[PDB]
Design a protein around this ligand. Structure first.
Ligand code: NAD
Ligand code: NAD
Ligand code: NAD
Ligand code: NAD
Ligand code: NAD
Ligand code: NAD
Ligand code: ATP
Ligand code: ATP
Ligand code: ATP
Ligand code: K
Ligand code: K
Ligand code: K
Ligand code: MG
Ligand code: MG
Ligand code: MG
Lengths: 489, 8, 489, 489, 8, 8, 8
């Protein structure tokens, strides 16, 4: 996007000042859309010495004479050329700038416009910068951030010591990764993305996107009227154990609720009977195990059952002991079908196995499982989209790294999911998503497409829960999936 | 009614 | 129907031109009902050299002076007498005909009236015919087909190389089989059936019908207030296995939801306990089996259980191995009760057994099962109503050949079902329908009546699902059956 | 406004390109507000070689990639620097320009953006310019004009041979006189005035304005609760004759309906009895005349009656013969009260009398009366605001020149009224307005304020008529005045 | 519902 | 819904 | 309002 600005100026020939005017006015229009008529409000505009601050001076100058009061506090040392030009306009138009503030300044103002730092933030915020940001955050005023809330790293969404908490963020061209990943996503408040006149071809070239309703709608498979269950594919789910009997059931229904034609579970006996007592639609094959866990003695039966399906999901509730490890790795090494690998199948996975598979795979770890899989800490893998991309590319798979914002990548293309809520922060949620992904693969979507559609719909179904989200359970999530699908079109 | 850009 | 036209002309004495006028005006009225006022639209009428095209000339002539523009493209070589007469009228009325077209002609028109071929289609469409049809299909104009969309074989619903995709089809006298069977049913779009003045006695003599709401309403059994469970019959369902424990439950509830008095399942122990944990209304008798499948050792217990019921359903989830084959065939040979034979009981059935049964039977195969049963390919049996009729007649049974359009026949009478949607394209759907049929038989309907009512209500219940149809499951289907029954009256 | 552009560039330092970008984007936003989503429409943008055309190139470039199709037809010879720069951007962004058009070009487009000529129009439009404008006007496409519809003189509202008829005009900074006066007001269609970033102090310095609802609301006099009829003033209306008995009644009620405390009419006997038979609230003093018209013999009685009032209105229905002329001129010469001079009192007025009056006057001619008063043709005075200003300034009066757009001036300040409709194009309308003005003067508004408020409310009352406007009569207008007053606050 | 001409 | 300026 | 057949 910094490249996009440069090219728009240097090669398309758009004056940098025109881009800056467009940025500033889009902030004014956004505020009006959010606050209604601006003419009764008093505005405090906090401007750094960079182009973010220059955008701020455009905002300030365009409010002059139209609102009750504008004051700029200029907090920088020097001004870039466009900031200087726009400071110069603000002052020629009759604007008041001050370079010092007292804590009390917030008193006489209703709206704070945060134009201190944008994408040019480098390093921790300290000093007077930190102090004014902490004062703004304690003030209870309406906060509108220009491009990115000051103090968020726009490439990662991390807080560099302290950051502005905004009610409204107006960003230019495209959302930045720091509006999408937490904590930055939280501090952004309501995000508007403004067109400031970059060529559309450049805006569209960005390789990391947010999954949108329109993208998911165009990916949803067709339901031709002359069809039968075989049209919509077959899934095998290898799951469960004497310890974890519920997982298979949630995974299986997850596949059925997204429109899969036939779902078969392989679950240790008698835990397999659990599934059909709850949903008799499912086929739940009993697997005879020595001690209630899959082992090498079940390898052959599982490969046999795989022959008549389009996709296999494995892992939810398997347990993690050595016999499971041997079974999972020998199975995946021989299985020549797409595989969705989750939960305990990830915990025991030998990643060499993925490199040697000819068939595709999707892996669906939470950060704890991803951390163990690559032998790093949770903090180092959490929201680490570049690590996710490298892993996907090196192992020839799709990686779905689950969190409040979920990252979906095949190594080339990376998509971010922002649907969902904390009702999914509860056992069983993941098991549903595994089934959804397998289901969409069975219906003919690529592993990446299936993952993109499933993460979006899984979170959207959660948002449709009628009562308080903290009471959402996986069973209720399942019931909501077909309403999510309907609302999507 | 918001009127920063347009008067009718 | 070609016979019906002939008799109406040659023996009732209706001039062929009167029939053709009536056909054409019914198309105009249908278009008005669908498009509102016609006076702003421009119409391109594509006319073959046959009587379909003659119908087209009547359409064109009746729009002259009343709509914005009409053009006829005449694509035939020679004209039949009625086509010639009506071409002659069109031209005397001031109409414009051309015999050549360029791809661009679609540009200046809003509605295409397709009168190229009707029931006189013979062989594949090629040449300029194919080319204009492909242009029409890419044009995004409103397409109205006269009688049948050109390129559909009206006896089978097959596409003869290429065919018009219509928004509205106006057919005369009676629906044709090619509007009812796919792919033709799909290409027909909204179908209107117009009365063009055939004697009603002739229209009513047709032996192959579409199952309608009125027919199903008059077949629904009575519920006299002074009644008890015995009034409404008893069903035995022989079903399930250690592999397939859910099937019995869906079949049993299928019978209960259509108003059957008592339902008993015979299911291998402990899989029988599944049914009553989900629905305690059911009676689920445990059958002690050697390895989890019915075998000859269970013959005597099953015949005993049959004595106190009105109908027996057999097959869903039995499995298909030799012991099941021996059991199913020896059972059906001795059972002197109506039988509903589904799923694995079809896969193992010896059709000699059907010929020797004194009692009635309904068979409910999907095309895969029908194909295996008569030793043909799926493509040769799919929508092959004449094969279905021969099979029913030769084996003295009712055959219910399931697909998006379901065919129900006893060899003499054949009915087509058009209710339902793709939510039924999912494991479990069939199991429900089996129970519904058995249930209606138990309540006193003939096997053919029971099958007619059950296929209609099963599809209608699916259409009543509130959310996206692809998320419909059998359990939800069951809950919808009594609402379908209520809406039917 | 040309001065306002210059000062904003040369002295405030706003780059001319920034103003041009702001102009173009405001057109895009305006079109979206009027048409909804732009993405399905095809746009033909007609660009001259001036800055109007440059504004057009900004429009075109900002639609690229976002709507279905954009084409620019460039109709000029050479380009100004900003037009050239923006042409250059449009082309760098992938835009298509052509320099020739055929009549058929309008075919493939839905919206015409008219950026041919703005305020730089000089002289009659001929040639290819005229031809494309005539083609656009016959096309029935949606027409959006940039600044002013091409062919309207923005200082006068005259059509220079031919002009674009727009559905939407987007103008910059302030409305131009040519959007306000006819025929230009008619060709403008819906007018939006966009803020493109001129300092507000400059926008507010313009000396010729449109009368707005807010201006009239703040001028409306106060109604303190502790008040009596004397608080709200007294009006004398000298009016009527044996020929014209209705005029006094409409003038009198006009004063009463705007909240005047007491209204007295002096009308020749017995025509005075007309007024109180219709409205007994009025005082209608009988004046004994020789032949049914005011004359010098009534001078003394009229001056006497004037002593106890705040304002005198004179003229409606007096007749115009020499005795009336002598009376009117001798009366106004001696009357030391504000005078509202209308109708026949204008037709006989000696303008020397106005110059010698110490007290104020408002004159309320239609163009016919103004023409006779200054000895010019109707065509030379109609909408001639500069002539109106000179007349007001030279005679020390307020002049209210009535027409579909009414001009109100005291020589320094000029206001334009755009309320009303053709229901006011009917005898009696004027008589009402005379009373309204006198009434507001009596309540304490300056003659200019009284005229501003009265013209606005008179037209607004007409717009409130429930049925077809052509059936509006003066009596119904009167009944609507207090609803206009209520809706104003 | 009137059905002399059309069945749906 | 008009989206020339803003995506949500 | 559709009027191919009937005028009122
Ligand atoms: N385009 C617009 O311009 C913006 C980018 O403009 P830019 O590239 O000039 O960068 P910028 O305005 O985002 O920030 C750069 C400015 O902040 C200062 N700065 C950066 N980190 C700091 C820190 N941690 N402590 C104190 N000062 C610090 C720099 O010295 C410079 O003055 C975009 O966000 C968008 O608003
Ligand atoms: O049994 P179990 O289910 O408790 O064990 P588990 O294997 O599923 O691991 C749970 C652990 O993983 C981590 N984790 C999971 N989701 C996370 C998220 N989005 N962000 C940060 N950490 C996350 C936590 O550190 C947690 O303690
Ligand atoms: N009654 C009305 O008349 C219609 C029946 O009239 P009809 O019996 O004259 O038949 P028709 O109009 O349906 O079609 C017969 C015409 O199409 C031609 N035709 C048939 N198949 C063709 C092919 N595959 N390629 C090129 N030309 C082909 C025949 O030569 C003849 O001109 C009914 O559908 C109804 O509209
Ligand atoms: O175990 P299972 O249930 O997969 O095996 P199954 O015995 O039920 O057979 C499934 C097969 O039957 C065929 N089939 C079922 N319904 C069909 C329809 N309406 N049209 C065409 N073919 C159809 C398909 O070819 C499919 O592969
Ligand atoms: N500011 C923006 O710029 C506009 C003013 O720009 P401008 O001052 O360049 O003027 P302009 O664009 O309104 O028009 C001037 C252009 O039109 C030509 N022109 C004027 N009258 C003509 C006629 N009668 N016949 C043929 N060509 C004629 C001139 O030669 C020049 O090319 C404003 O309306 C606003 O849009
Ligand atoms: O008796 P009477 O009332 O017919 O005579 P009058 O003295 O009131 O004059 C009527 C004449 O004045 C002119 N006039 C009035 N209003 C006009 C308007 N807005 N625009 C152009 N001309 C206008 C017309 O030329 C008309 O013939
Ligand atoms: N706060 C949140 N906001 C949005 N999505 C969330 C949130 N918390 C969890 N999720 C989602 O819920 C799912 C949790 O799956 P995960 O495998 O992490 O948990 P789980 O307890 O193991 O579920 P299961 O028992 O099914 O394995 C993921 O899709 C994750 O993205
Ligand atoms: N696209 C469709 N439109 C209408 N009806 C459909 C469609 N697809 C399937 N059906 C119906 O659903 C039922 C499917 O029964 P079938 O025996 O073919 O499938 P199944 O998976 O075996 O169900 P079960 O598991 O109960 O045996 C049939 O009535 C069939 O007509
Ligand atoms: N088409 C119109 N649109 C708006 N206002 C109009 C229109 N036609 C006339 N008017 C207004 O109606 C009033 C007409 O007064 P005028 O003195 O011209 O006519 P009149 O017939 O003499 O009325 P009266 O009989 O009361 O003297 C003026 O205010 C004029 O501005
Ligand atoms: K900022
Ligand atoms: K046809
Ligand atoms: K213009
Ligand atoms: Mg999990
Ligand atoms: Mg079946
Ligand atoms: Mg008058």
């Amino acid at each position: 996007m910094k490249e996009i600005d440069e090219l728009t100026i240097k090669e398309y020939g758009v004056d940098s000042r025109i881009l800056m005017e467009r940025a500033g006015i889009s902030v004014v229009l956004a505020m009006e859309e959010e606050l209604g008529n601006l003419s009764d409000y008093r505005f405090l505009v906090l401007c750094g010495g960079g182009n973010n601050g220059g955008d701020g001076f455009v905002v300030a100058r365009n409010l002059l004479g139209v609102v009750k009061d504008v004051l700029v506090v200029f907090l920088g040392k020097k001004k870039t050329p466009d900031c200087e030009y726009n400071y110069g306009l603000y002052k020629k138009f009759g604007g008041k700038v001050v370079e010092q503030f007292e804590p009390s300044i917030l008193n006489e103002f209703d709206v704070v416009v945060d134009a201190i730092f944008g994408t040019g933030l480098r390093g921790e915020i300290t000093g007077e910068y930190a102090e004014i940001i902490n004062l703004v955050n304690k003030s209870g005023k309406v906060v509108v951030s220009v491009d990115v809330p000051s103090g968020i790293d726009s490439n990662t969404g991390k807080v560099l010591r302290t950051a502005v908490k905004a009610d409204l963020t107006v960003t230019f061209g495209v959302p930045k990764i720091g509006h999408i990943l937490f904590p930055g996503r939280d501090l952004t408040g309501k995000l508007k993305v403004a067109n400031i006149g970059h060529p559309v071809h450049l805006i569209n070239s960005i390789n990391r996107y947010v999954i949108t309703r329109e993208m998911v709608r165009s990916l949803l498979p067709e339901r031709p009227r002359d069809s039968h269950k075989g049209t919509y594919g077959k899934v095998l789910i290898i799951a469960g154990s004497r310890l974890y009997s519920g997982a298979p059931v949630l995974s299986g229904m997850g596949s059925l609720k997204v429109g899969t034609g036939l779902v078969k579970l392989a679950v240790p006996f008698p835990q397999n009977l659990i599934a059909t007592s709850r949903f008799p639609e499912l086929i739940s094959v009993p697997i005879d195990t020595e001690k209630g866990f899959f082992s090498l003695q079940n390898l052959q039966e599982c490969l046999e059952l795989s022959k008549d399906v389009d996709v296999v999901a494995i892992g939810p509730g398997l347990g993690n002991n050595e016999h499971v490890r041997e079974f999972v790795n020998e199975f995946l090494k021989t299985l020549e079908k797409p595989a969705v690998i989750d939960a305990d199948a990830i915990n025991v996975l030998d990643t060499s196995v993925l490199k040697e598979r000819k068939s595709p795979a999707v892996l669906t770890p939470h950060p704890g499982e991803m951390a163990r899989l690559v032998k790093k800490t949770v903090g180092d893998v959490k929201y680490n989209y570049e690590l996710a991309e490298e892993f996907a590319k090196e192992n020839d798979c799709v990686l779905v790294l689950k969190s409040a914002t979920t990252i979906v990548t095949d190594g080339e293309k990376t998509l971010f999911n922002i649907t969902g809520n904390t009702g999914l922060s509860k056992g069983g949620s993941g098991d549903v998503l595994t089934g959804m992904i397998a289901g969409f693969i069975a219906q003919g979507l690529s592993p990446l497409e299936a993952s993109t559609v499933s993460v979006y719909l899984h979170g959207f179904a959660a948002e449709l829960f009628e009562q308080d989200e903290r009471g959402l359970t996986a069973s209720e999530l399942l019931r909501l999936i077909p309403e999510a699908i309907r609302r999507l079109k | 009614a918001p009127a920063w850009l347009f008067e009718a």
